[PDB]
Each structure stands twice: as structure tokens, then as C-alpha cells.
Amino acid sequence: SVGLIWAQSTSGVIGRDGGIPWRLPEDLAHFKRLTMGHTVVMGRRTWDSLPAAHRPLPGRRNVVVTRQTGLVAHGAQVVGSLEQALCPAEPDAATWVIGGAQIYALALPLANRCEVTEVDVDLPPEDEDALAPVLDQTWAGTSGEWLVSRSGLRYRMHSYRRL
């Protein structure tokens, strides 16, 4: 059972300049709660983007997807494909794919749940941005209310399940 979890601007941006181009503490808390104790699968660029204090993510089984043979990711398990990441030698009840755009596209056919934070931030996409997946008609969801962050941004959470 594989879920994707991401935060996106309403315009669909998830990443810029090797990071996330807004600050949304309530999203960090949401992400922390959903993933603690579970497996988190990420692309190598997302692994390299992590803040020092969260590389690896504490209290979670970190898995990093790369084409590099012999890459070492201290504190994580390195695998060579998303399929390998979803075939662990030690099964986990809950596996979360935590980005980025390349790994989400590989993961979406294998997933049955998406947890999406939508951020009302004016971010006209730029040419090198990482963009969110778009969920087609095989997905249906439920939306929480629009809330205001202590940071000032409006945001809301969506939960999708494969039909």
C-alpha cells in the first residue's frame, strides 16, 4: 500500500532552486504526523534538498532512488528503481513517496492514496520548476476547509484515493 504526499502551490509548483518556495509550518506538521514511524521513499535530488537536521528524516525508514551505482546516502537505504523501493526485504505496513516530481511520476501508477497540501501562494511557474502530478479521473478525493497559516498563507489539505 503506497501513498504519495506533496505540497503544491495552486499553480502546481512543488520545487524551485533545489527547495520548496514557500514556508508553511502547518504543512510540515501535517507531513511529520502522517509519516512518522513509516517508510519514506524519495528521489536522489529530494534527498540532497533536505535540511541538515532532517537528512535522514528521523524516526522513519529513509529510502533513496538513484541511478548511481555505489552512491552512499548515510542514514538511508539506496535503491536503483522505484519498484525496488516498493519491494523492501523487510515489509512496512505504510510506505509514503515524499518526492520529488520525477519520483512522483514513477510512483503514481503504483499508488492508491495521495495526500496533497494546496498552498494559495502566487507563484507563476518558472522554466526549471518541479511541478506536481495531476490526478486524472481514476482518483477521487475529499477537501478540508481553507485555513490560514500562522505564517499568513491560505492552505488546505486534500485526501485522494484511487477509484
Ligand SMILES: NC(=O)c1ccc[n+]([C@@H]2O[C@H](COP(=O)([O-])OP(=O)(O)OC[C@H]3O[C@@H](n4cnc5c(N)ncnc54)[C@H](OP(=O)(O)O)[C@@H]3O)[C@@H](O)[C@H]2O)c1
Ligand atoms: N513540495 C513538496 O511536497 C516537495 C516534495 C519533495 C521535493 N520537493 C522539491 O522538488 C525538487 C526535487 O524534485 P525533482 O523532480 O527535481 O527530483 P527527485 O524526483 O527528487 O529526484 C530525481 C532523481 O531521482 C533519480 N531517479 C529518477 N528517475 C529514476 C529512475 N527511473 N530510476 C532510478 N533513479 C531515478 C535520479 O537520481 P540520480 O541523478 O542520482 O541518478 C534523479 O536525478 C526540489 O526542488 C525539492 O525541494 C518538493
Ligand SMILES: CCc1nc(N)nc(N)c1OCCCOc1ncccc1N1CCC(C(F)(F)F)CC1
Ligand atoms: C515538508 C515538505 C513536504 N510537505 C508535504 N506535504 N509533502 C512532502 N512530500 C514534503 O516534502 C518532504 C520532503 C522535502 O522536505 C523538506 N523540504 C524542504 C524543507 C523542509 C523539508 N522537510 C521538513 C520536515 C522534515 C521532517 F523530517 F520533519 F519531516 C523533512 C524535511
Ligand SMILES: [Cl-]
Ligand atoms: Cl519529525
